């Protein structure tokens, strides 16, 4: 017996195109996307060049009206040159990210000041989500309050962060988060077994004491997102290793392992991978969308999963039950065990449709 | 310049029918919704005969489907007798709603322990909403954490009532709160005017610093919900006067002077009268469904509104700045500038539809 669930959104994932294909591309990141029960992702915009003025806006978006075999949407970058300058395009991307710790030359912000520009900036109504590890999240909380409006924190990793996050909630702020499934299933313990190169991620990886953190306070976790960050293996084991893992194909078996377990509820999960992913970025609903999924399978991840370029994985090993049979996204039969029958260019822009711009006063 | 929004949904309404047609039916209180901008309704239990078994949901069905012109779907209501015989249709329901306070004897509760039952035996997966008024707030909470469950508390009134959901949530409590036009624009600061028959509503009518402790923890309500609750005029102003208000033409326009005066934004107005009545009680998206409507035309609200049978109002006289133009349903106009266009029975039951059934553990 299967069961259904809607169309799953996740709301944090790198697809590489343009400019770093090897890793992954459009084609490749949303075949993983729809194997792992994704019907729509919003791709960061840190690709090369960089999406963070008009005209790499309009090449990404071909790119991806091309290439994507599910929905989606595309976020802007905010760079130490373009506050003031996006009011024409924002509202046609997912929102704005600010890279606020390490990041490439052209998204590195100089200043907290120009932190402050750009949420002064950019259209009030249109959501920004902050890259923001350890101390980062309450700067970024305070330059969010001078400004009078929400932001929305990326990948929570730490104890120290989740609790900063419930004591601004708990004053009222508006402020929502999400975790990744690696700093859920993974911590310090692992590093060993996987060793110092496929290791690096930022946020890094936690302590036993941080994924504790994180379960024991899921009531404060608005949204589950992957952080789909793909490499290759060659490049996670040479002599300067990007950060990143892989994580569209092994996200939701994942999580109903845990489910299964008791751990959080199927509405919990739900809530995380869904609803909450709508309501913060005002995602449309997608027609005739949902996905199949078989709670009982028991299975083992592999080496690699079969979409992903990166084609390696940091889950290698672990024990799972729970896996998607079938996927149908907008009346068409999109992923069937094992086989994407959607090809590149099905997918399309959410922010195109009529339900998919976001409201706001005249 | 008109604004689009989404498909309103209000998670608290009477419609009267069956039993008490003079005072509303399906067809006159779904054409009220339609005129206040709401396309889905979800409809309380407390008829004549109340729906507290399966043979009163099956006529119940029937009558709305014949007679609604908005989407919608059915409560059942708790009683002494029916813990544990609801399981065959509990998934058709919108919820099971629970009367804690004053009610009619059929839906009269004698003990905490049959609320105990109740949480027990309805299944874990579905709704659980309650009438609770201050101590019985605490009390149903804790009926909740003894069955290891959620709840929704209706019509928060009261500043004591507000502040121990904030205490319950900022311990991680899987609790949920709507709120009722009349406790956040009257108060008791109005009986003079409505007089003591007129003024009748359960929760009754806050002080004003009730009033202002509402709008200070706007961030602890999850939604807006109408307490939409016909009676006629000769009823209110007679001997035995019964409790409520008519609201469902005047929620969004209250709602709108509000957010034009700078209260709320329009996207606190939206997770609260659409994301956040979707995600609590698992209700499916409105395909080709949204509503425009006009944020600055100012109007005075009549002695009655068109549409209610109630035809009276406890708003009459004051002043509001928004105004529903034209709502299309599923891709039918169905309300254009005062003129309701789809006929009874155009309405469906969510709950039919394979995308409204909450999902579950095999
Ligand atoms: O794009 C990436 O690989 C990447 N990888 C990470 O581990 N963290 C980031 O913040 C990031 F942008
Ligand atoms: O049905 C009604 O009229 C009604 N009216 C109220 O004012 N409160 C209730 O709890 C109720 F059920
Ligand atoms: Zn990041
Ligand atoms: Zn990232
Ligand atoms: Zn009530
Ligand atoms: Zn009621």
Same mark, same amino acid.
């Given at each position: 017996?299967?069961?259904?669930?809607?169309?799953?959104?996740?709301?944090?994932?790198?697809?590489?195109?343009?400019?770093?294909?090897?890793?992954?591309?459009?084609?490749?990141?949303?075949?993983?996307?729809?194997?792992?029960?994704?019907?729509?992702?919003?791709?960061?915009?840190?690709?090369?060049?960089?999406?963070?003025?008009?005209?790499?806006?309009?090449?990404?978006?071909?790119?991806?009206?091309?290439?994507?075999?599910?929905?989606?949407?595309?976020?802007?970058?905010?760079?130490?040159?373009?506050?003031? =300058? @996006?009011?024409?395009?924002? +509202? #046609?991307?997912?929102?704005?990210?600010?890279?606020?710790? %390490? /990041?490439?030359?052209? &998204?590195?912000?100089?200043?907290?000041?120009?932190?402050?520009?750009?949420?002064?900036?950019?259209?009030?109504?249109?959501?920004?989500?902050?890259?923001?590890?350890?101390?980062?999240?309450?700067?970024?909380?305070?330059?969010?309050?001078?400004?009078?409006?929400?932001?929305?924190?990326?990948?929570?990793?730490?104890?120290?962060?989740?609790?900063?996050?419930?004591?601004?909630?708990?004053?009222?702020?508006?402020?929502?988060?999400?975790?990744?499934?690696?700093?859920?299933?993974?911590?310090?313990?692992?590093?060993?077994?996987?060793?110092?190169?496929?290791?690096?991620?930022?946020?890094?990886?936690?302590?036993?004491?941080?994924?504790?953190?994180?379960?024991?306070?899921?009531?404060?976790?608005?949204?589950?997102?992957?952080?789909?960050?793909?490499? =290759? @293996?060659?490049?996670?084991? +040479? #002599?300067?290793?990007?950060?990143?893992?892989?994580?569209? %194909? /092994?996200?939701?078996? &994942?999580?109903?392992?845990?489910?299964?377990?008791?751990?959080?509820?199927?509405?919990?999960?739900?809530?995380?991978?869904?609803?909450?992913?709508?309501?913060?970025?005002?995602?449309?609903?997608?027609?005739?969308?949902?996905?199949?999924?078989?709670?009982?399978?028991?299975?083992?991840?592999?080496?690699?999963?079969?979409?992903?370029?990166?084609?390696?994985?940091?889950?290698?090993?672990?024990?799972?039950?729970?896996?998607?049979?079938?996927?149908?996204?907008?009346?068409?039969?999109?992923?069937?065990?094992?086989?994407?029958?959607?090809?590149?260019?099905?997918?399309?822009?959410?922010?195109?449709?009529?339900?998919?711009?976001?409201?706001?006063?005249?």
């Amino acid at each position: 017996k299967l069961v259904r669930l809607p169309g799953l959104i996740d709301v944090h994932v790198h697809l590489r195109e343009p400019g770093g294909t090897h890793k992954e591309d459009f084609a490749s990141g949303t075949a993983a996307a729809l194997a792992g029960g994704i019907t729509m992702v919003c791709a960061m915009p840190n690709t090369r060049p960089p999406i963070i003025d008009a005209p790499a806006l309009a090449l990404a978006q071909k790119l991806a009206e091309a290439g994507a075999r599910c929905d989606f949407a595309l976020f802007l970058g905010a760079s130490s040159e373009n506050a003031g =300058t @996006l009011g024409t395009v924002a +509202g #046609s991307a997912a929102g704005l990210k600010l890279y606020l710790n %390490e /990041t490439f030359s052209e &998204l590195r912000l100089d200043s907290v000041v120009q932190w402050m520009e750009h949420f002064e900036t950019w259209p009030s109504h249109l959501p920004i989500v902050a890259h923001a590890e350890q101390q980062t999240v309450a700067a970024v909380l305070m330059v969010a309050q001078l400004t009078q409006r929400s932001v929305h924190i990326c990948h929570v990793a730490q104890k120290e962060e989740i609790l900063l996050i419930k004591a601004a909630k708990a004053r009222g702020l508006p402020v929502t988060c999400e975790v990744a499934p690696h700093h859920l299933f993974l911590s310090h313990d692992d590093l060993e077994r996987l060793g110092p190169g496929k290791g690096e991620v930022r946020p890094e990886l936690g302590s036993r004491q941080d994924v504790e953190a994180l379960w024991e306070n899921m009531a404060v976790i608005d949204c589950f997102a992957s952080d789909h960050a793909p490499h =290759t @293996l060659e490049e996670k084991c +040479g #002599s300067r290793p990007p950060p990143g893992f892989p994580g569209l %194909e /092994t996200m939701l078996p &994942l999580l109903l392992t845990a489910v299964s377990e008791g751990r959080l509820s199927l509405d919990d999960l739900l809530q995380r991978l869904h609803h909450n992913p709508r309501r913060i970025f005002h995602l449309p609903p997608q027609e005739d969308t949902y996905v199949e999924v078989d709670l009982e399978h028991e299975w083992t991840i592999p080496s690699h999963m079969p979409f992903s370029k990166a084609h390696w994985t940091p889950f290698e090993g672990q024990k799972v039950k729970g896996t998607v049979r079938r996927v149908v996204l907008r009346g068409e039969v999109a992923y069937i065990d094992g086989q994407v029958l959607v090809p590149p260019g099905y997918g399309q822009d959410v922010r195109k449709w009529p339900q998919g711009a976001v409201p706001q006063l005249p």
